[PDB]
Amino acid sequence: QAARLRRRQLIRQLLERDKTPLAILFMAAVVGTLVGLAAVAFDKGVAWLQNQRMGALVHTADNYPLLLTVAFLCSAVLAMFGYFLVRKYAPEAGGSGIPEIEGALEDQRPVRWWRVLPVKFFGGLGTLGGGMVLGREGPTVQIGGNIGRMVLDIFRLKGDEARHTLLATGAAAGLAAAFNAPLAGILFIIEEMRPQFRYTLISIKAVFIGVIMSTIMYRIFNHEVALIDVGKLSDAPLNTLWLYLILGIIFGIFGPIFNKWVLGMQDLLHRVHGGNITKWVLMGGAIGGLCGLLGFVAPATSGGGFNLIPIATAGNFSMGMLVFIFVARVITTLLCFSSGAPGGIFAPMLALGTVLGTAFGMVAVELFPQYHLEAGTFAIAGMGALLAASIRAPLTGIILVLEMTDNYQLILPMIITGLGATLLAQFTGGKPLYSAILARTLAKQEAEQ
Amino acid sequence: QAARLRRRQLIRQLLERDKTPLAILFMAAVVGTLVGLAAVAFDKGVAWLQNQRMGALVHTADNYPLLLTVAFLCSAVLAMFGYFLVRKYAPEAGGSGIPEIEGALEDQRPVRWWRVLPVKFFGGLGTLGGGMVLGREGPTVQIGGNIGRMVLDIFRLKGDEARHTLLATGAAAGLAAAFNAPLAGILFIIEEMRPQFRYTLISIKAVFIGVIMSTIMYRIFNHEVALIDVGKLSDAPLNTLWLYLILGIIFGIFGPIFNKWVLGMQDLLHRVHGGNITKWVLMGGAIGGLCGLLGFVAPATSGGGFNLIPIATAGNFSMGMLVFIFVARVITTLLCFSSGAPGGIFAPMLALGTVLGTAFGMVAVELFPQYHLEAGTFAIAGMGALLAASIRAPLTGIILVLEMTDNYQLILPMIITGLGATLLAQFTGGKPLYSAILARTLAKQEAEQ
Numbered sequence: 087q088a089a090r091l092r093r094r095q096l097i098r099q100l101l102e103r104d105k106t107p108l109a110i111l112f113m114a115a116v117v118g119t120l121v122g123l124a125a126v127a128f129d130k131g132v133a134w135l136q137n138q139r140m141g142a143l144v145h146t147a148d149n150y151p152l153l154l155t156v157a158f159l160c161s162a163v164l165a166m167f168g169y170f171l172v173r174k175y176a177p178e179a180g181g182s183g184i185p186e187i188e189g190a191l192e193d194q195r196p197v198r199w200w201r202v203l204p205v206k207f208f209g210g211l212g213t214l215g216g217g218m219v220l221g222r223e224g225p226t227v228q229i230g231g232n233i234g235r236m237v238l239d240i241f242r243l244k245g246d247e248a249r250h251t252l253l254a255t256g257a258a259a260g261l262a263a264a265f266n267a268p269l270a271g272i273l274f275i276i277e278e279m280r281p282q283f284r285y286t287l288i289s290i291k292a293v294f295i296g297v298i299m300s301t302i303m304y305r306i307f308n309h310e311v312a313l314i315d316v317g318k319l320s321d322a323p324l325n326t327l328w329l330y331l332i333l334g335i336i337f338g339i340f341g342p343i344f345n346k347w348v349l350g351m352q353d354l355l356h357r358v359h360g361g362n363i364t365k366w367v368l369m370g371g372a373i374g375g376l377c378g379l380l381g382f383v384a385p386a387t388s389g390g391g392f393n394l395i396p397i398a399t400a401g402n403f404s405m406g407m408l409v410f411i412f413v414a415r416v417i418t419t420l421l422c423f424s425s426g427a428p429g430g431i432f433a434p435m436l437a438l439g440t441v442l443g444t445a446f447g448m449v450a451v452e453l454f455p456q457y458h459l460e461a462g463t464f465a466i467a468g469m470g471a472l473l474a475a476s477i478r479a480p481l482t483g484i485i486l487v488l489e490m491t492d493n494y495q496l497i498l499p500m501i502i503t504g505l506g507a508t509l510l511a512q513f514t515g516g517k518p519l520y521s522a523i524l525a526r527t528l529a530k531q532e533a534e535q
Numbered sequence: 536q537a538a539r540l541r542r543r544q545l546i547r548q549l550l551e552r553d554k555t556p557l558a559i560l561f562m563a564a565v566v567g568t569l570v571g572l573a574a575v576a577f578d579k580g581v582a583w584l585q586n587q588r589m590g591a592l593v594h595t596a597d598n599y600p601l602l603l604t605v606a607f608l609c610s611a612v613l614a615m616f617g618y619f620l621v622r623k624y625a626p627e628a629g630g631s632g633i634p635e636i637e638g639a640l641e642d643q644r645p646v647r648w649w650r651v652l653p654v655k656f657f658g659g660l661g662t663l664g665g666g667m668v669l670g671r672e673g674p675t676v677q678i679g680g681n682i683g684r685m686v687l688d689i690f691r692l693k694g695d696e697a698r699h700t701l702l703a704t705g706a707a708a709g710l711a712a713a714f715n716a717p718l719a720g721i722l723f724i725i726e727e728m729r730p731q732f733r734y735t736l737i738s739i740k741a742v743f744i745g746v747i748m749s750t751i752m753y754r755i756f757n758h759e760v761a762l763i764d765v766g767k768l769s770d771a772p773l774n775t776l777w778l779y780l781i782l783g784i785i786f787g788i789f790g791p792i793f794n795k796w797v798l799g800m801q802d803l804l805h806r807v808h809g810g811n812i813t814k815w816v817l818m819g820g821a822i823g824g825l826c827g828l829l830g831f832v833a834p835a836t837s838g839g840g841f842n843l844i845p846i847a848t849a850g851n852f853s854m855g856m857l858v859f860i861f862v863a864r865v866i867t868t869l870l871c872f873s874s875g876a877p878g879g880i881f882a883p884m885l886a887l888g889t890v891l892g893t894a895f896g897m898v899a900v901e902l903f904p905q906y907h908l909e910a911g912t913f914a915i916a917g918m919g920a921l922l923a924a925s926i927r928a929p930l931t932g933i934i935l936v937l938e939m940t941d942n943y944q945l946i947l948p949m950i951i952t953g954l955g956a957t958l959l960a961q962f963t964g965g966k967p968l969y970s971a972i973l974a975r976t977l978a979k980q981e982a983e984q
Contacts, residue, residue, distance in 0.1 A: 088980075090984070091982075093643060093977060093981065094981070096641070096643070096977070097974055097977045097981070099732055100970050100973060100974045100977075101970070101971070101974055103731060103964060103966070103967060103970045104961070104967060104970075105961065106676060108963075109560060110587075143729060194538075194541075194545070268946060268947070269930075269933075269934070269946075271929065275726070276725060276726070277739060283545070283549075283734075284734060285732070285733060285734040286973075290726060290930065291929075291954075291957060291958075294930070294950075294954050295954065295958075297950075298947065298951060301947060302773070302776070302947065305773055305947070306773060324754055324755060326749070462731060464567075478552075480554050480740075480743065481721065481739070481743070484718070489943075492943050492944075494938075494941050494943065496750070497717065497718070498750060498754070499634070501717060501743075501747050501750075505740075505744065508553075508740060509560075509744075512554065512555075512740075513557075513812065517550065518552055518553060521549055521550075521552045522550070525546050525550050528542060528545065528546055528549075532539070532543065532546070
């Protein structure tokens with residue numbers, strides 16, 4: 087019996103637990119500071135591009151056949167440029183980027199900073215300036231991992247406790263600086279981007295630095311923002327705690343259908359051009375110009391995602407509009423993300439969850455009105471629900487919605503909805519979206535040679 | 536060369552990600568409910584014993600030495616009855632419990648549900664009703680551990696996934712039923728109670744059910760009381776963000792002296808024990824009687840801990856009062872926990888951090904008048920710093936302080952204090968407490984075999 091040998095090894099691996107090197111605890115601060123500055127510069131650039139694009143319609147608001155075309159081509163040229171830089175200089179920039187960092191924490195998909203920083207930072211700037219539904223989360227995790235890998239390659243410190251830690255600190259502080267949520271950025275690393283099938287050794291004490299040294303460099307510049315500002319909705323008593331289970335299983339039915347939709351659209355938009363860079367560039371231009379035009383005509387369907395959370399959680403939408411800005415929002419998120427643009431998916435699904443949530447509340451206050459409900463609670467219940475039924479990160483979903491909204495009282499409706507999402511989106515037969523995209527792009531590389 | 540086999544093994548086990556069997560995913564709800572309904576029956580029992588012990592003290596209120604004699608003996612008896620059952624029927628019941636469950640998740644220290652439940656639930660009841668300074672979650676996490684092996688044994692679930700997940704989903708639901716924090720139990724299972732150096736398939740969905748099915752039981756039976764209710768302390772702007780790092784440095788120097796004292800006091804009390812069960816029971820009765828005597832006169836020295844948090848996070852204590860509370864509370868916390876008694880160190884350190892935080896704030900508001908400070912912020916930021924400089928579970932400490940106080944608007948001072956504590960506690964050379972106690976227990980096990 088070698089269990090005595092295993093116990094004798096454990097009794098001396100248990101004393102030296104959580105003792106990380108000073109070199110890693112000093113390089114993590116510089117990684118966090120550089121990714122915080124890069125995320126602040128990216129946010130300032132996309133804000134300046136949106137402002138300079140909106141400051142021409144006001145200059146020429148006299149004729150619709152010219153105004154629509156000026157809103158079209160100025161929103162299409164930036165998207166065309168952002169598609170071109172990605173499909174010429176770095177083909178691993180297209181898409182979200184959480185697949186590539188999740189792969190690079192497993193030593194497949196070799197991570198680069200030669201040509202992934204100055205391609206993603208300008209392609210995401212172009213394809214989020216001209217307003218399309220992309221979300222500023224994908225092109226900051228990839229600008230987070232490569233900054234840490236650049237720091238490690240410059241300062242020439244070797245080992246294997248370093249290549250996995252300075253690559254996850256950057257990927258944590260690239261999400262703790264795009265959302266101003268210092269906890270969701272580390273709970274994404276803890277249970278979604280860590281390699282889930284073998285024992286790895288990253289240090290939470292060195293991811294915990296970097297996240298703070300990037301959040302402080304966020305809060306220096308972007309002061310008093312508070313990007314969602316709905317405050318103190320009504321609490322949800324234990325009598326009406328069972329409608330959120332029906333909301334959960336509705337989101338869990340919907341989730342895998344959305345996953346099959348985007349994983350079919352990635353192959354359907356592929357065969358319309360056949361991999362050619364010129365037809366890819368023209369398709370990206372025509373798919374960015376349409377969402378730039380819809381960013382002015384009916385401007386609460388296509389663009390951003392955070393513009394219509396507070397005017398739909400506690401407020402007014404006559405339910406015809408609430409069906410319209412769900413159907414149009416799905417048919418434009420499936421185009422702007424599956425077309426191959428360098429953008430995220432988080433902010434589209436955070437906007438996509440709350441519309442269906444407040445649409446469920448708009449009928450839950452109608453049927454059985456003895457509960458004295460209000461249709462604002464179901465929006466925050468269903469914010470982090472499609473994010474939990476399509477990615478299977480319910481802890482990150484619950485923590486992120488608790489961070490950006492600050493309504494702690496309905497944590498049991500949030501937990502119940504985000505858990506009844508996954509408990510039926512597993513049995514229906516769906517797969518987590520990043521762990522499907524990574525397996526598809528690993529099979530596409532393994533089927534070569 | 537083996538990268539091809541590694542990739543073809545990654546793809547197949549990556550496509551079937553997060554698919555847990557229904558036989559585990561249904562027993563998780565039963566083990567959640569059977570520990571929520573038996574943790575509210577521990578909370579109500581200790582509250583009933585505290586109420587009857589206080590009410591018997593009123594029945595004679597004229598003869599003061601006879602009154603103090605009754606207040607001494609009626610706590611010494613309920614301490615002796617809680618010490619005797621532990622030293623007679625379960626030698627692993629005393630202490631805290633979280634070392635024993637962290638051991639049992641790594642296949643040493645076997646869980647014994649026929650004699651850890653009806654001695655913990657009837658000994659922690661007595662030794663916490665007797666007015667000793669011990670946490671509530673200590674006798675609840677171990678009960679959650681030994682309920683999961685009961686469910687698995689009486690439903691004869693085979694396989695190795697189930698005995699590793701039904702322990703964790705009971706130990707999370709016990710801690711969430713103790714604090715009414717349904718986000719602290721899972722985030723304590725993930726980063727501290729998990730096996731650190733191996734790979735273990737604890738299902739996050741199975742531990743994320745159970746915590747909700749125990750929080751629902753706690754909210755159903757226990758009506759809204761909000762056991763810590765400090766309300767809306769002011770926000771800390773970015774200019775005054777450098778004082779909390781100094782507070783963290785003070786906590787990180789104090790932490791690894793507290794660890795050395797609590798590990799030396801065990802040997803000091805064991806030397807006067809000698810292992811004899813009569814000397815054990817008599818010494819436990821004397822210490823429980825001293826805590827019951829200090830519960831009546833100067834009622835802030837002993838106690839559960841949660842009595843003085845909403846009265847110390849408002850600044851109406853004097854500095855001499857705060858230093859007397861701290862000095863005569865560290866002594867009784869050491870003397871009551873290091874003797875061996877079924878109660879956690881978690882809530883005594885959660886209430887021991889707030890006094891040092893406000894003793895720092897009461898000089899921070901007087902030495903820098905140009906900041907417009909408020910001494911409650913330093914107390915609410917130092918509430919969870921001894922948990923991060925002694926146990927080294929800083930994410931669990933920060934999450935739990937956010938859950939029990941609902942003051943989100945300052946989280947950079949909390950996340951700086953809880954991290955500048957653990958850095959300057961690592962650079963002093965102290966071990967985490969639950970990974971020192973299990974090492975001493977395995978050393979005492981490996982005497983001669």
